[PDB]
């Protein structure tokens, strides 16, 4: 009919959603968790020092075995490291040196990456020839690839610079489902423990929940005031944290449909680059733009410790599947492990 | 305490040597970033010098060049402009004829104003503090022909001078250079694009050589 009525209905729906979220807010998390003992100080030291890359590292991901981890840098080469021996398993020379995202399949057979180039290059690590070759080139995106994660052994979902997301099939190499709910550049992407849901953050200061089978937006959060740089799913699959430039992390829940609490400090004025949860979820490690990484309590929201092993902006952060250690990457061209 | 990991360590050392060699070969080539409003100017510059990121390799006087064109991206630069922090110099292209022509969705905005704003934003960026800029003023003959009838005061009301080429050219050069704030750290290399070839490449080579000299002198503390 007319745009006036549509905008009025949208505003009414937003007001109704806000009223529902306000009414659902019975109690807070800080007041209840006050009866829990504090985690105290945690002292983590650099157990290993990886000095293979020669450029700024931007992304990394742990494998299912909790021993192998892939890393991407601006030099245009991917390196598979052995955490126990720091050995280089394979060196994948990338055709595009502007890589800023990488993924490690759960089966340990294929690895993906991307960046300014809209084409996502897939690589197989268990070829009979013994040399890593390009498995398939997934093209079709308009903006730069920000994050990618292997949904399964044959399916992969990635986010592009544009305000859309797509799910690719390695068998055919076509967009099985295209999401068009975001209104800004997508920067983060994380899969849920059940593999049926996944969350993604964009520069529109909001985080939305998507469904793989349904292919529609399940929920939308608007607790942040700036762009979201990272997102991680809670181990239980009912919550997820997000990092933004406003230096105020916010935890959300899929069942409450709102922000539980926030993590921030006065001296902390720099933005967040990466966020990850421990195996139990009690510790929330987040890497900032500063040369240090802080550890936050998921329940008490206190600085349990700080990591001053790097001398440059922290770019990525990933905890092992077994929670035995955590690796932190930075633009200093080094990748260290903490525990 | 090693039985079979000896071959693994040997492979690791070989891979490290290969990566170090590739890095020594990678850093051996000069890297440049191509920016500027308008696609015709950048296209003409790339043609004279010979989708996503567009990669181009061309050697001149035994010096390698890696031209980076991000005009086809069309996205918020705030989240990926920092990737070019290590570039040597940024080539900014702007057509002088734009002083009169405007974009489609202008709403009382001149294309020259948008070009100047983009130049100021890219110059005063925190990631390009020590990165030089090479400004090329394209469409020389077209601009010289338009100024014969269309005056320059249409875009710059404060301009008070003769509607000639030399005066207007110098005024535009000053206006583009005035946008620079780091007069001590920055160094803008301005040049008027010519129709004949083998001229812009020479200026680019000279500017790259000067920037390399200045960088090597600053790294030692003598500049």
């Amino acid at each position, epitope marked *: 009919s007319e745009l006036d009525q549509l905008r009025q209905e949208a505003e009414q729906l937003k007001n109704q959603i806000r009223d529902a979220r306000k009414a659902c807010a019975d109690a807070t998390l800080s007041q209840i968790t006050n009866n829990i003992d504090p985690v105290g100080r945690i002292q983590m030291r650099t157990r290993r020092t990886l000095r293979g890359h020669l450029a700024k590292i931007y992304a990394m991901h742990w494998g299912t075995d909790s021993r192998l981890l892939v890393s991407a840098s601006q030099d245009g080469k991917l390196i598979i490291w052995d955490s126990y021996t720091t050995n280089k398993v394979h060196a994948i020379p990338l055709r595009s040196s502007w890589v800023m995202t990488c993924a490690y399949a759960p089966s340990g057979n294929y690895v993906a990456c991307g960046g300014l180039d809209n084409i996502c290059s897939i690589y197989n690590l268990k070829t009979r*020839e*013994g040399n890593v070759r390009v498995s398939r080139e997934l093209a079709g995106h308009t903006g730069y690839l920000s994050c990618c994660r292997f949904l399964d052994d044959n399916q992969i979902v990635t986010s592009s610079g544009d305000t859309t997301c797509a799910l690719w099939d390695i068998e055919t190499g076509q967009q099985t489902t295209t999401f068009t709910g975001h209104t800004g550049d997508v920067m983060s992407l994380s899969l849920a423990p059940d593999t049926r849901l996944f969350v993604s953050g964009a520069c529109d200061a909001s985080a939305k929940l998507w469904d793989v089978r349904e292919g529609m937006c399940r929920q939308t959060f608007t607790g942040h005031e700036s762009d979201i740089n990272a997102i991680c799913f809670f181990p239980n699959g009912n919550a997820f944290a997000t990092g933004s430039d406003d230096a105020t992390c916010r935890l959300f829940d899929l069942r409450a449909d709102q922000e539980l609490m926030t993590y921030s400090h006065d001296n902390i004025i720099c933005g967040i680059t990466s966020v990850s949860f421990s195996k139990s979820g009690r510790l929330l490690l987040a890497g900032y733009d500063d040369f240090n990484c802080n550890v936050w309590d998921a329940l008490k929201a206190d600085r349990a410790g700080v990591l001053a092993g790097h001398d440059n902006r922290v770019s990525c952060l990933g905890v092992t599947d077994d929670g035995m250690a955590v690796a932190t990457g930075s633009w200093d061209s080094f990748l260290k492990i903490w525990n | 305490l090693s039985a079979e990991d000896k071959a693994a360590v*040997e492979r690791s050392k070989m891979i490290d040597r290969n990566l170090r060699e590739d890095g020594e070969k990678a850093a051996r080539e000069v890297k440049l970033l191509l920016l500027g409003a308008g696609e015709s100017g950048k296209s003409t510059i790339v043609k004279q010098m010979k989708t996503g990121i567009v990669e181009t390799h061309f050697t001149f006087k035994d010096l390698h060049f890696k031209m980076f064109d991000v005009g086809a991206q069309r996205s918020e630069r705030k989240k990926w402009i920092h990737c070019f922090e290590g570039v040597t110099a940024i080539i900014f292209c702007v057509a002088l004829s734009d002083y009169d022509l405007v974009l489609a969705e202008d709403e009382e905005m001149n294309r020259m104003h948008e070009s100047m704003k983009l130049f100021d934003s890219i110059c005063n960026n925190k990631w390009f503090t020590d990165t030089s800029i090479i400004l090329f003023l394209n469409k020389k003959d077209l601009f010289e022909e338009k100024i014969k009838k269309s005056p320059l005061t249409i875009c710059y009301p404060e301009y008070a001078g003769s509607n000639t080429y030399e005066e207007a050219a110098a005024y535009i050069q000053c206006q583009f250079e005035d946008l620079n704030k780091r007069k001590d750290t920055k160094e803008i290399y301005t040049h008027f694009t010519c129709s004949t070839d083998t001229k812009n490449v020479q200026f680019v080579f000279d500017a790259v050589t000067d920037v390399i000299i200045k960088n090597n002198l600053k790294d030692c503390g003598l500049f």
Partner: single-chain antibody
Amino acid sequence: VQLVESGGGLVQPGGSRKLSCSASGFAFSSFGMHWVRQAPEKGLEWVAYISSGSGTIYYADTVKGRFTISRDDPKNTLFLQMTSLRSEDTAMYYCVRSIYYYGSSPFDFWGQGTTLTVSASADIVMTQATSSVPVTPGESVSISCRSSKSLLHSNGNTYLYWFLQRPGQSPQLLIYRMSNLASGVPDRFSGSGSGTAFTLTISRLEAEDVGVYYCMQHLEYPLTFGAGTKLEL
């Protein structure tokens, strides 16, 4: 993936021969090469080994210093120069590739081999309980062996590799480290071990299993193969 070996034939005592093998289908530079000798009335036997970077070249005691191995990276051809060949060296030689990394499967591909006929201590000892056992299709069989030293290394890995040599074909890797099966091997094969004693269980035996099963240890460079267990239908 194919390895065409050449340079066999007859040779008089004390002579010299240069065995050549051209690699194709894979990166010859990245893979290391192994020479496995097998006499007409004996089992497999390790000869020499060369790494990818042509470094750390080790030879066996029986051929220590007498033979030498070389390779050509740009040519992708393996060379084995033998001098002062003895009568005891009369046997067929096999060429095997190997790549070492976390999760690798060394000794996965075995070449054809060329027959070489000569005209007229402290190493790991592998001993098998039985050399020949009768088998029938559809039944389940097990092969057991023993080692003079515990192969279980401090890192938890056990350097034990099993091979099967069918009549008229080269050996094939069945199970490496007793935990991961080689590519293309049916899942009906299973292996176990206790640090010193090892066993190989083959369920649902088929005519394709008729052959001689060999065992190999890789904890020490002086490899040593077992006596070999032959399964007769």
